[PDB]
Curated annotation (Swiss-Prot), chains A, B, C, D, E, F, G, H:
This is Superoxide dismutase [Cu-Zn]. It is found in: Cytoplasm; Nucleus. Homodimer; non-disulfide-linked. Homodimerization may take place via the ditryptophan cross-link at Trp-3. Heterodimer with SOD1. The heterodimer CCS:SOD1 interacts with SLC31A1; this heterotrimer is Cu(1+)-mediated and its maintenance is regulated through SOD1 activation. Interacts with DAOA; the interaction is direct. It comes from Homo sapiens. It comes from the Eukaryota. The protein (both wild-type and ALS1 variants) has a tendency to form fibrillar aggregates in the absence of the intramolecular disulfide bond or of bound zinc ions. These aggregates may have cytotoxic effects. Zinc binding promotes dimerization and stabilizes the native form. There is a cross-link at residue 3 (1-(tryptophan-3-yl)-tryptophan (Trp-Trp) (interchain with W-33)). Belongs to the Cu-Zn superoxide dismutase family. It is linked to Amyotrophic lateral sclerosis 1: A neurodegenerative disorder affecting upper motor neurons in the brain and lower motor neurons in the brain stem and spinal cord, resulting in fatal paralysis. Sensory abnormalities are absent. The pathologic hallmarks of the disease include pallor of the corticospinal tract due to loss of motor neurons, presence of ubiquitin-positive inclusions within surviving motor neurons, and deposition of pathologic aggregates. The etiology of amyotrophic lateral sclerosis is likely to be multifactorial, involving both genetic and environmental factors. Spastic tetraplegia and axial hypotonia, progressive: An autosomal recessive, neurologic disorder characterized by loss of motor abilities in the first year of life, after which severe, progressive spastic tetraparesis develops. Affected individuals have severe axial hypotonia, hyperekplexia, hypertonia, and myokymia, reflecting upper motor neuron involvement. Cognitive development may be affected. Destroys radicals which are normally produced within the cells and which are toxic to biological systems. The ditryptophan cross-link at Trp-3 is responsible for the non-disulfide-linked homodimerization. Such modification might only occur in extreme conditions and additional experimental evidence is required.
Length: 6, 6, 6, 6, 6, 6, 6, 6
């Protein structure tokens, strides 16, 4: 699982 | 920007 | 910026 | 598990 | 589950 | 901004 | 679980 | 800002 918010 | 892979 | 990998 | 917020 | 609000 | 992952 | 608020 | 991880 990988996620990002920028 | 948001994204995810699972 | 926030991100995580698990 | 790794994560970061900056 | 992942969530966010901006 | 608020975020979370579970 | 990880959470944050900015 | 507040953050946590459990």
């Amino acid at each position: 699982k990988v996620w990002g918010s920028i």
